[PDB]
Structure 1
Amino acid sequence: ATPADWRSQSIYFLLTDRFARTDGSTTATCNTADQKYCGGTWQGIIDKLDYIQGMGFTAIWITPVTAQLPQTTAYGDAYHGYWQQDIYSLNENYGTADDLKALSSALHERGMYLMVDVVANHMGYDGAGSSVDYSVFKPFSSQDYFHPFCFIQNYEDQTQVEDCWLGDNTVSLPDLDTTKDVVKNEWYDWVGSLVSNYSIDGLRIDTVKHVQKDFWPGYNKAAGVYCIGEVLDGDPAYTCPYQNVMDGVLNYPIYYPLLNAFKSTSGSMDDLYNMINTVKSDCPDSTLLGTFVENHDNPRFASYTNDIALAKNVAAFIILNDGIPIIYAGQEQHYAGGNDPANREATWLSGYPTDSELYKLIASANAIRNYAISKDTGFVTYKNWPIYKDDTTIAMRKGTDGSQIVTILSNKGASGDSYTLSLSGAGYTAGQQLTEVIGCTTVTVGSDGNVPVPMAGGLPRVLYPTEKLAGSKICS
């Protein structure tokens, strides 16, 4: 599927080993500290697609599928998929080729997309960089395919970042020489055939900043689908230019100020407001980036604060910001693990309840985004616009005049007082009735254009014109 097809999508990102077992157990042990395979599979995912689609997601991003190093190392097993060794075989832990094809098929029957995580930068090896036996890699079975062994020392030095190796002498990540034609041609053949064989709709590309820019356009073309790259840097001046070589990137620039604004009742709304505008104007296309506040490479949101209202606000923001929302499996069950491996909790241990507070919040927010898109062909390309901020509040507006969604977020938290916010800048017409679609109440725009928004319990508010909801299931 094309970048244009992807704008409307909403992604649930999961770790295949950690999301759902074939046997559907909600009690099977998964001790994150042990860093071992816990038994999640592609068949497991198929059987829980209703859980995901019930939150209003239209796509999933699963971790890499290639055969990995087989050892249990001092850092555990390759359960996460990022330590590949044989790119033409699949990771048997997750199932067979037929199972991966069954997963893509199942998503397609539901009108959903499959996005697969891929690594081009490196293989993985159990042991010291100096001791690597290159014959174990397929098809890159020779030192000649790789950059000389050195570990990255200075992440400020982009040459080193691209040319030296990730990992360490316990698990080393041999760095492919992506400047060689034989390497490029092999990867380009591979990714086109991977996409074809498994009917993959999009790719998430790992470790993009660690491969020279002039590798990516050919890879994105060979894939033939939308690619979103992991460029792990919060500076928009460093990260957004990667959109010149790849369709999208993960929105790490928004990540940092977004997390800071809501992780406590004293977070900075100014920083978030300003970053929204910075990304809007400076990135080739904000509407092709992926918004997130939780993933497998940072502490989860709830690891900073257990306040359920704060978690509701940040989830609402992710869904209603420019670009493609991305929620990480567990966020909807208010998982609170810190840094890797603590943030790779098994989703099944939650019991998958569909009545958790965040499941319902996420469902409500995806519901209105999906509906708005179905009625407003301009919504996905309309640039999200911050219209208001104060010490504890940010409001923003996205959508064509007459159909815009206006979102008011608060960092007051669960102890927030009940008051009326006099909201200016929403751009509705005097006297227009709006529905607050999270709590299903109504508000009417004043004759001066102002919207009186009832605030309470630190809760997010999401407004949309009532007449436009006619015939929908939203607040019915």
Structure 2
Amino acid sequence: ATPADWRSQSIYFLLTDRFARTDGSTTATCNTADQKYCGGTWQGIIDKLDYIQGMGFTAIWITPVTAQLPQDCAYGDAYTGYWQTDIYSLNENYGTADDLKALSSALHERGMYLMVDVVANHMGYDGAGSSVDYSVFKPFSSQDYFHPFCFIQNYEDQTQVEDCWLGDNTVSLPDLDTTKDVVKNEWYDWVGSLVSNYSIDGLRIDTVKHVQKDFWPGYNKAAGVYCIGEVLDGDPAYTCPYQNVMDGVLNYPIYYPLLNAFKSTSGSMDDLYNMINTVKSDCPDSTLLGTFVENHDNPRFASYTNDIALAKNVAAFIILNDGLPIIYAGQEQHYAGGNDPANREATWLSGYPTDSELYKLIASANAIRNYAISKDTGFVTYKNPYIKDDTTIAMRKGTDGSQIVTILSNKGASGDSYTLSLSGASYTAGQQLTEVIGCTTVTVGSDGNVPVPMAGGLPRVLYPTEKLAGSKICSDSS
């Protein structure tokens, strides 16, 4: 497992307790509002995962791993189960050490890959630094591995964020990094073996940005297998660049505007076409960039506009565009969610309406992506081209051998029968291009100005229809 394969794999974000559960549990008590562990065994994947496959995605992205603390801290618990007040044990709320390597060893055979998201920096403690414990921190026992105490402030600076304390008295994410050999070197050794057995064939960070330049590389290398630095900031020239340090980069910046212009019918697409461009070099790519949408710490896209179209075109472009297109857990069922605590949400809180709107769009469209490569790879690199940006967007992605997919997406669930001519996408005068998912034929002959026929947001991607043999895809029947 490692960097050049990864690039291509659709990403699927989960929790577990909330998701996983051999029990099915259609009615299981667990309303974020009250937080606290919802008895939901990780193992649930071997019975589960049919949820991911139907969609097109090849990766399993789920939460950090250990045992934080046992005592519903006012807040209501760490179930989000990012923290580390033990790192070296391996919980039980989930269910039984061994089983994990087993869940993986299992699927690993079955299909897809393994993404383990880590928060390395903070060791999470109930209490205020002056009330600091130190004894609850294995691999630690002393304070020394941790840091001094000051509230991260003067944000803009970047001469504190990377060392100082991260949090609010109510909880103090204890800062480790004495600045020198110790911490890094240390935590370096750890991961790479944690990796050894249990799975760990792709990894990620919750604490990128504020780390200190150097730690990212050291760790990225401590354990081979591809990495994803997660933290935020979304602003091409800093969020990107670190692509070199690490491996995979959060497309933090990509999302922001996609959110910005998406939602509001007239929204403001130019900000993007200019955007798509900034990254495309500014970031050392190799296609090593990450596409979220909703975002755990964020309110599931839906918090805004309550319409499929605005949703579909987004999710599609995300996936369809440059970077890992990560469909976050609950995206599908159209779970509005909340800025926080109410972002979690047992994807299973229902018996799998496995054929709802989002499921269908995901399945049929994601497939095409993977498919294209299989017969002819190289769609990876292909710098996802801006070709044209009007009131609505259309871009070009792929190789030679009439091996070309061109995507044009518009906004408004209100809809209004929309028929245009795709500008670039430069094809062969007479060439036939299928609609995608739902199907529909696009004629690119006459002048060389491809007829694009829209309804509201469906999204509309024009695939060459000559490179599909006798297979699945669109309207073959198989």
- Counterpart in the other structure of 2:414: 415
Q: Distance in 2 between matches of 1:351 and 1:5?
A: 34
Note the C-alpha offset of 1:409: 4.4
Note the C-alpha offset of 1:419: 2.6
Q: Distance in 2 between matches of 1:407 and 1:131?
A: 59
CA 1:204/1:403 → structure 2, altered by over 3 Å: closer, same or farther? farther
Aligned residues: 475
SS of the residue 1:146 aligns to: coil
Q: Distance in 2 between matches of 1:25 and 1:392?
A: 45
What per-residue deviation string (whole Å, max 9, x for no partner) do you get for residues 309-348 of structure 1?
A: 1111111111111121111000111110120112112211
SS of the residue 1:443 aligns to: strand
The answer to whether the 8 A contact 1:59-1:113 is kept is: yes
Q: Percent identity?
A: 98
Note the C-alpha offset of 1:440: 1.1
CA 1:168/1:44 → structure 2, altered by over 3 Å: closer, same or farther? same
CA 1:125/1:315 → structure 2, altered by over 3 Å: closer, same or farther? same
What per-residue deviation string (whole Å, max 9, x for no partner) do you get for residues 96-153 of structure 1?
A: 2212112211221122101111111111111112111101100122111111012212
The answer to whether the 8 A contact 2:147-2:176 is kept is: yes
The answer to whether the 8 A contact 1:32-1:342 is kept is: yes
The answer to whether the 8 A contact 1:17-1:80 is kept is: no
Note the C-alpha offset of 1:44: 1.6
TM-score, normalised by the number of residues in structure 2: 0.96
Note the C-alpha offset of 1:408: 3.8
Note the C-alpha offset of 1:215: 0.9
SS of the residue 1:109 aligns to: helix
CA 1:387/1:237 → structure 2, altered by over 3 Å: closer, same or farther? closer
The answer to whether the 8 A contact 2:64-2:83 is kept is: no
CA 1:112/1:237 → structure 2, altered by over 3 Å: closer, same or farther? same
Q: Distance in 1 between matches of 2:278 and 2:406?
A: 19
Q: Distance in 2 between matches of 1:407 and 1:340?
A: 37
The answer to whether the 8 A contact 1:228-1:249 is kept is: yes
Q: Distance in 1 between matches of 2:321 and 2:251?
A: 11
Please say which of residues 440-449 and 37-46 is displaced more in the overlay.
37-46
Note the C-alpha offset of 1:406: 3.7
The answer to whether the 8 A contact 1:241-1:284 is kept is: yes
CA 1:402/1:415 → structure 2, altered by over 3 Å: closer, same or farther? farther
Q: Distance in 2 between matches of 1:382 and 1:412?
A: 26
CA 1:407/1:40 → structure 2, altered by over 3 Å: closer, same or farther? farther
Note the C-alpha offset of 1:249: 1.1
Note the C-alpha offset of 1:156: 1.4
The answer to whether the 8 A contact 1:376-1:403 is kept is: no
The answer to whether the 8 A contact 2:91-2:97 is kept is: no
CA 1:50/1:224 → structure 2, altered by over 3 Å: closer, same or farther? same
CA 1:153/1:17 → structure 2, altered by over 3 Å: closer, same or farther? farther
Q: Distance in 1 between matches of 2:22 and 2:76?
A: 22
What per-residue deviation string (whole Å, max 9, x for no partner) do you get for residues 408-465 of structure 1?
A: 4444322121131111101221101111112111112123211101111332012211
Q: Distance in 1 between matches of 2:265 and 2:390?
A: 10
- 5+ long unaligned stretches in structure 2: none
Q: Distance in 1 between matches of 2:86 and 2:104?
A: 22
CA RMSD of aligned residues (A): 1.6
Please say which of residues 117-126 and 66-75 is displaced more in the overlay.
66-75
What per-residue deviation string (whole Å, max 9, x for no partner) do you get for residues 252-275 of structure 1?
A: 010101111212212221111111
CA 1:156/1:46 → structure 2, altered by over 3 Å: closer, same or farther? farther
SS of the residue 1:343 aligns to: coil
The answer to whether the 8 A contact 2:68-2:78 is kept is: yes
